[PDB]
Design a binder for this molecule. Structure first.
Ligand SMILES: N[C@H]1CC[C@@H](CNc2nccc(Nc3ncc(C4CC4)s3)n2)CC1
Length: 291
């Protein structure tokens, strides 16, 4: 039906014999991730395997492969190929040894310098998407991958949306409750700045270790978000002033006053970024903590 379009995007042939030595490195929602070995040419890959029946809205699987294949960028995980295997779609990507930003924010303490360096590379990914008319809608530490060179890349395009000058705003109540911007949570028309909000939230995770209200349930977080607006930090006096300033412009209630990704890339806060090799001690720490 609309699945006819899906079957025509995919490459054909045996992924189970183009690739081997499969271990689970991850299991998200409609995403089991494996690493594997390309028997031909030798390279190591990440393959995401998704059950077709779990996703009723197949137009999102299509939109996922398209956006990734059409918006390649050094701060986005690299799409290689895809395959339909029975009741399951396999997406193949370039593997990056490293871990999730989630492992770092939950197991280590980041300094301002490291936080600024992550924020800068995420803002580069978002300025690129936003200029190509794509909103991610699911920004969070869990969708940021850090390489063993200190590479920072954005992943997980399954929720993203395309806009145009004619349909410049979206209205679907989509995202992960704790990172969602109030305009989304309260069903108003919204734009690429919802990702800036989410990025503000992720900067909170890097400070405190968790998005605000994580101990609450998802529906409660949604109410809290609708009712507080701008979240508050447990301990604001621990942050520099320019960093408080940066948060403030990421977490503005007025969409008009909230920064754009282009704007925020000029913020003085990112001037303090460490070099990205600053991040590899974190990754090592995180790997040790999760052993
Ligand atoms: N949502 C996140 C994204 C997948 C990731 C799986 N865990 C992981 N662990 C160590 C290294 C590593 N590198 C990757 N490179 C490319 C990868 C492509 C998007 C699958 S994953 N991934 C963490 C869950």
């Amino acid at each position: 039906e609309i699945l006819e379009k899906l079957r025509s995007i995919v490459s054909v042939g045996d992924p189970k014999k183009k690739y081997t030595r499969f271990e689970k490195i991850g299991q998200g929602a409609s995403g089991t991730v494996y690493t594997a070995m390309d028997v031909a040419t030798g390279q190591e890959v990440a393959i995401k395997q998704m059950n077709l029946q779990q996703q009723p809205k197949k137009e999102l699987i299509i939109n996922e492969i398209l956006v990734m294949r059409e918006n390649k960028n050094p701060n986005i995980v690299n799409y290689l190929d895809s395959y339909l295997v029975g009741d399951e779609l396999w997406v193949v990507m370039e593997y990056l040894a490293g871990g999730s930003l989630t492992d770092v924010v939950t197991e280590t303490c980041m300094d301002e310098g490291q936080i600024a360096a992550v924020c800068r590379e995420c803002l580069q990914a978002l300025e690129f998407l936003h200029s190509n008319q794509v909103i991610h809608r699911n920004i969070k530490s869990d969708n940021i991958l850090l390489g063993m060179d200190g590479s920072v890349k954005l992943t997980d395009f399954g929720f993203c949306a395309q806009i145009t000058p004619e349909q410049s705003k979206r209205s679907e109540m989509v995202g992960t409750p704790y990172w969602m911007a109030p305009e989304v949570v309260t069903r108003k028309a919204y734009g690429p700045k919802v990702d800036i909000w989410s990025l503000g939230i992720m900067a909170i995770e890097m400070i405190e270790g968790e998005p605000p209200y994580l101990n609450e349930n998802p529906l409660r977080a949604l109410y809290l978000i609708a009712t507080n607006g701008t979240p508050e930090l447990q301990n604001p006096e621990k942050l520099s002033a320019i960093f408080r300033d940066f948060l403030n412009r990421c977490l503005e209630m007025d969409v008009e006053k909230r920064g754009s990704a282009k704007e925020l890339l000029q913020h003085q806060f990112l001037k303090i970024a460490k070099p990205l090799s600053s991040l590899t001690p974190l990754i090592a720490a995180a790997k040790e903590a999760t052993k």
